[PDB]
Design a protein around this ligand. Structure first.
Ligand SMILES: CO[C@]1(C(=O)O)C[C@H](OC(C)=O)[C@@H](NC(C)=O)[C@H]([C@H](O)[C@H](O)COC(C)=O)O1
Ligand SMILES: CO[C@]1(C(=O)O)C[C@H](OC(C)=O)[C@@H](NC(C)=O)[C@H]([C@H](O)[C@H](O)COC(C)=O)O1
Ligand SMILES: *[C@@H]1O[C@H](CO)[C@@H](O)[C@H](O)[C@H]1NC(C)=O
Ligand SMILES: *[C@@H]1O[C@H](CO)[C@@H](O)[C@H](O)[C@H]1NC(C)=O
Ligand SMILES: *[C@@H]1O[C@H](CO)[C@@H](O)[C@H](O)[C@H]1NC(C)=O
Ligand SMILES: *[C@@H]1O[C@H](CO)[C@@H](O)[C@H](O)[C@H]1NC(C)=O
Ligand SMILES: *[C@@H]1O[C@H](CO)[C@@H](O)[C@H](O)[C@H]1NC(C)=O
Ligand SMILES: *[C@@H]1O[C@H](CO)[C@@H](O)[C@H](O)[C@H]1NC(C)=O
Ligand SMILES: *[C@@H]1O[C@H](CO)[C@@H](O)[C@H](O)[C@H]1NC(C)=O
Ligand SMILES: *[C@@H]1O[C@H](CO)[C@@H](O)[C@H](O)[C@H]1NC(C)=O
Ligand SMILES: *[C@@H]1O[C@H](CO)[C@@H](O)[C@H](O)[C@H]1NC(C)=O
Ligand SMILES: *[C@@H]1O[C@H](CO)[C@@H](O)[C@H](O)[C@H]1NC(C)=O
Lengths: 362, 362
């Protein structure tokens, strides 16, 4: 008798973990009303209310960002966070705007998901400060009247005068138990031609370099609309330099330390949005693509009649997350299944485990 | 009764294609003795003797390179070429050496395979020349006593004097029937500090730029060992600029035009090596990784007792390629299968179609 796949995330072995926010945080005071997952699964998630893996990449606690030291391990992974950086946040650093930050948001989540698929542990870590330099200013945002905090990672600096400089930062091989066989490191820049400071238009740019690596940005065109853009990089542990072109420089202060597993396993991401009376985005949906990530989209609006509030407790997702209670045998875009011979609908890729074949073929 | 998967490439639907070299070229005079595939499958392959998709990316006919206008379409793809650029070629442009070109080789094949997995057609195309410029030299190799041809793509140029310049190149939306919804474009540079020309050490670097794109390289350190390194880029059709920092500039003269299909399907690559009395590399094996590419490695040496010569006709691969004669129902790392209920061994990912489950689970 053919089994119907249960739409939502699953796991085939005890060795899975989740990553999330308030909707998976049993430390939040509204528990279990604010959950979108089963309560006995909280210990499998690494989650903090108000945070997201995107925020935590860029900011420390402060100026409205709630940061979190995300850390977990699992062959199989369930990602359910992101909404805490949506257009609703109304953030911008220069003139990139919200849509500009949806662009950054996709870039990050795209890199994280694909890197995660070849990893078991993911650990946000603090990098040691670079070799000291002097006569410098930290970068600042003009966005939101100068109240928008430019990220703590990567850290921007501005030299009082044009200068020749290269500075050393370290991406470690390990962080307290975990192996960092690779790192997810942000490289952000401001585009749109030369950058105006005190009536002088300086060429904007700098680079990450080492003997086996290079990533850079440069511009000295006619000034126009400036955008704070981020690239997200896979960098191997080791010693790197950050080099200026004269006036500007960034160094990373944080990375996502990740190890490596030989068998690659698609991650799972569930849609993280707000109620309809708040601006959401489809970054997760755009970032979580085949074949490295399995996307479970919400068909309905965010509706929580039995939750703590209109944004915490959604019926749809609660139903999806029910699948993480059963030791499944197949994890697919169509959902999870137990070990069975036939299926009620075609299983498509990316999948893994042992999946039933479509009955109508037999 | 459980079926054993046939180790090697397969196809589930008539809509597959191959990409290859002499070992899949029915135009070569040694046919069918020099083939590694079934002869009636030649019409499915796009192949030229002595060529490879890596060579064709970088060179026109001449100076020992045999170029080919590779072009094919298929939901499912079988890649079997590469050996015509192995360490055996003894090529180098600067001091990167053979291993340096194995590095370039991995980069290309890695990008091609993953891009191909989201495409149906792959077409090598010629780009229109950039807006004219003057007082310039084409770049040249020092490697092999100045007899090594620096690639025709991307084209390097050197300005007689330090200059401000930006030049326009076009990545088209279509090429005679096919849609180029994306392009695979090479961006190559020479690293190792400032570049010595006529007793002056110039900063080496330049960039590709547009309003929605940037890729660059720069260096002005102490001169050391110079290496010609390539990055391989996914760029959308449109108008781009190539900008210099003063002395150097590259523009692309070719790209791989590719369209987009919504369902992503892992490609298949078979090991392309020489006989043991020739230096091969494992670029294909390194480039063809899960989950975007399925690798069929050779367990044996290249042995062709019934071929045209020690390098054309291999027994092992000939046996693998037998699987492309049957309309399979499952394509896996373990090989192809027909539609069956059970399998003699565990099917692992990346796979696609409808695959039998491991008997020992039942
Ligand atoms: C502090 O005032 C200024 C300055 O003259 O330095 C004015 C300057 O704004 C003007 C009037 O051009 C502003 N730059 C830009 C491009 O918006 C510029 C930057 O916002 C500020 O210097 C911080 O820059 C970076 C890189 O973080 O700040
Ligand atoms: C033609 O002679 C020279 C020159 O003085 O211009 C000598 C120069 O070699 C010496 C003696 O430093 C060579 N540069 C390098 C780094 O090897 C340099 C380059 O090989 C040549 O200019 C081509 O350069 C590029 C970018 O293709 O060529
Ligand atoms: C931020 O502060 C909260 C309490 O406000 C605390 O639980 C947490 O440790 C902090 N986050 C980080 C990343 O330090
Ligand atoms: C962001 O702005 C919109 C309208 O512009 C508003 O509805 C929303 O409450 C604002 N959000 C915050 C957190 O201030
Ligand atoms: C800039 O910020 C860094 C990191 O947050 C901090 O350690 C340093 O004190 C700041 N420097 C200046 C000059 O404000
Ligand atoms: C940068 O651009 C400005 C305006 O085009 C020019 O005057 C200045 O000399 C340039 N600087 C460099 C280093 O090219
Ligand atoms: C996900 O769901 C929403 C609402 O149905 C839809 O608007 C959006 O386009 C979907 N995105 C993806 C990537 O499936
Ligand atoms: C190179 O020349 C061969 C014959 O030597 C010819 O078949 C082919 O068209 C040429 N290749 C390209 C890419 O023009
Ligand atoms: C490349 O060099 C090796 C030995 O250095 C030699 O065996 C081989 O024949 C050379 N290949 C060519 C094509 O000249
Ligand atoms: C440089 O090479 C290009 C492309 O092969 C060619 O069209 C041009 O004539 C060459 N220019 C010079 C100055 O040698
Ligand atoms: C490049 O480096 C050399 C040697 O360090 C220096 O003399 C020269 O002025 C530099 N040029 C630029 C544009 O930084
Ligand atoms: C492929 O096969 C050769 C010979 O058995 C081996 O040396 C090589 O490491 C293999 N590489 C991969 C990626 O499987």
């Amino acid at each position: 008798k053919p089994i119907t796949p249960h739409y939502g995330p699953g796991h085939i072995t005890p060795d899975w973990c989740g990553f999330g926010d308030a909707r998976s945080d049993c430390g939040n005071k509204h528990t279990p009303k604010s959950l979108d997952i089963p309560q006995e699964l909280c210990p499998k998630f690494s989650s903090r209310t108000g945070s997201s893996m995107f925020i935590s990449m860029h900011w420390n606690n402060g100026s409205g960002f709630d940061a979190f030291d995300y850390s977990n391990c699992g062959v199989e992974k369930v990602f359910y966070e992101g909404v805490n950086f949506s257009p609703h946040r109304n953030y911008t650093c220069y003139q990139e705007g919200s849509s500009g930050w949806v662009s950054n948001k996709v870039g990050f989540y795209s890199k994280l998901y694909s890197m995660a698929s070849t990893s078991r542990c993911i650990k946000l870590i603090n990098l040691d400060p670079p070799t000291n330099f002097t006569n410098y200013r930290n970068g600042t945002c003009v966005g939101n009247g100068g109240t928008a905090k430019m990220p703590d990672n990567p850290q921007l600096v501005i030299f009082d005068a044009v200068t020749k400089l290269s500075t050393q930062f370290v991406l470690p091989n390990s962080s307290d138990g975990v192996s960092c066989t690779k790192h997810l490191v942000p490289f952000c820049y401001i585009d749109g031609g030369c950058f105006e400071m005190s009536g002088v238009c300086h060429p904007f740019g700098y680079y990450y370099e080492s003997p086996s690596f290079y990533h850079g940005f440069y511009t000295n065109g006619t000034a126009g609309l400036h955008s704070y853009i981020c690239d997200y990089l896979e960098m191997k542990p080791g010693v790197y330099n950050a080099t200026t072109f004269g006036k500007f420089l960034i160094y990373p202060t944080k990375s996502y330390c990740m190890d490596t597993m030989n068998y690659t396993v698609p991650v799972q991401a569930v849609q993280s949005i707000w109620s309809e009376n708040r601006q959401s985005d489809d970054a997760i949906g755009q970032a979580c693509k085949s074949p490295y990530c399995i996307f479970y989209n919400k068909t309905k609006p965010y509706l929580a009649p039995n939750g703590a509030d209109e944004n915490h407790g959604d019926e749809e997702v609660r139903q999806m997350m029910q699948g993480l209670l059963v030791n499944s045998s197949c994890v697919s875009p169509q959902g999870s299944t137990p070990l069975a011979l036939y299926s009620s609908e075609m299983i498509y890729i990316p999948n893994y485990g042992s999946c039933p074949q479509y009955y109508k073929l037999f």
